[PDB]
């Protein structure tokens, strides 16, 4: 479900040109079309739809490179 929640937020904030259902778990989101400003909105969405606070050590491009990276990062937090 956590996977699906993340995917909805990526639709909520990702600003991606191609729909989230047509994006694999392990896949380059930035190549897909995730911009800097968007990735930060997305990050804020992942903070809103759950109730967590990323450490600024994981506040980077790598944590949001892919849905799986996001899922794993979120899991590694709680």
């Amino acid at each position: 479900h956590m996977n699906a929640t993340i995917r909805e937020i990526l639709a909520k904030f990702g600003q991606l040109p191609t729909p989230v259902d047509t994006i694999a778990d392990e896949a380059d989101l930035y190549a897909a079309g995730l911009s800097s400003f968007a990735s930060v909105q997305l990050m804020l969405g992942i903070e809103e739809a759950f109730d967590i606070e990323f450490p600024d050590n994981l506040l980077n491009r790598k944590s949001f490179a892919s849905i799986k990276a996001i899922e794993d990062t979120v899991k590694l937090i709680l």
């Binding site: 800097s36 930060v40 990050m43 804020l44 506040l59 980077n60 491009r61």
Partner: protein
């Protein structure tokens, strides 16, 4: 106490506001020689524009400044009401109240960096030529950060060279200038190092932007020990914006792709203060080589 504080007597007069000072003839003479030195290193084919201290609020909104540095922005407001309304505001002030409650925003802000107005100007010319475009820009800039430290002003002069083109055009431009600027700093007898850095993006959102910027090496600074060797002051910056402004303003390179942009920024007041901190306030006592470099 701040090592810089003692400079104030020869360089500045108070204007009743932290970070806003009147400049003496001594100080201005050095700012002017520094500007002339920077001009002497201008690359061929560089278009020079000078901007006023204000710019379009709509342009600045479009450029994304609000998302990134809303805390630093100075907006222009005025008394835009009727004669009766204005007279009343003035009368409230006469009676111990606040006339500023009658202010409303104008369509202008104080410019936070000299390069912002150049991007729409470049965009208005159509696709870029091969090799891109280079500009020499300057403006008096404003950032709302009141401080008593002489190296942290609210109103300050910025001089920039700006490159708009392909990623290769821009990255080579930034490398040429990083080397050239260090050579200039050495000629001026300054002590410095160059290090990666990041802009002071606001809020939690901004911590991520700052992280990515540092990680992607989008910003170098030339840092000079002024207040201390442990916390040196950035007196120049070397900035790569990737396609951020090219995309925002619809600038197309000669290959039809969204243009990249970058800039080299010289903080004129910071450099002048650095010179005085480094060599003292008596110009005839400056090293002969430094005097020669500046045409003194």
């Amino acid at each position: 106490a701040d090592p810089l504080d003692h400079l104030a007597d020869k360089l500045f007069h108070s204007m009743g506001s932290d970070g806003v000072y009147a400049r003496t003839a001594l100080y201005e003479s050095i700012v002017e020689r520094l500007a002339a030195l920077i001009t002497s290193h201008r690359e061929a084919g560089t278009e020079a524009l000078r901007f006023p201290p204000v710019m379009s609020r709509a342009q600045l909104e479009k450029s994304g400044y609000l998302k990134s540095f809303p805390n630093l922005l100075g907006c222009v407001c005025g008394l835009h009401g009727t004669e009766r309304e204005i007279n009343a505001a003035v009368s409230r002030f006469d009676a111990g109240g606040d006339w500023t409650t009658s202010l409303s925003p104008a369509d202008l802000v104080l410019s936070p960096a000299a390069c912002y107005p150049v991007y729409p100007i470049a965009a208005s010319r159509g696709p870029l030529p091969k090799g891109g475009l280079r500009f020499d820009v300057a403006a008096d800039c404003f950032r709302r950060e009141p401080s008593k430290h002489l190296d942290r002003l609210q109103s300050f002069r910025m001089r920039e060279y700006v490159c708009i083109g392909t990623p290769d055009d821009v990255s080579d431009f930034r490398e040429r200038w990083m080397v050239r600027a260090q050579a200039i700093a050495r000629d001026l007898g300054l002590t410095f190092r160059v290090d990666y850095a990041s802009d002071p993006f606001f809020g939690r959102a901004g911590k991520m932007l700052a992280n990515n910027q540092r990680d992607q090496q989008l910003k170098f600074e030339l840092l000079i020990p002024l207040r201390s060797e442990e916390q040196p002051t950035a007196c120049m910056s070397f900035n790569y914006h990737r396609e951020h402004f090219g995309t925002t303003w619809g600038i197309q390179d000669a290959n039809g792709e969204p243009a990249h942009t970058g800039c080299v920024a010289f903080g004129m007041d910071r450099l002048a203060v650095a010179m005085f901190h480094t060599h003292g306030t008596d110009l005839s006592a400056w090293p002969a080589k430094v005097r020669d470099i500046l045409g003194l």
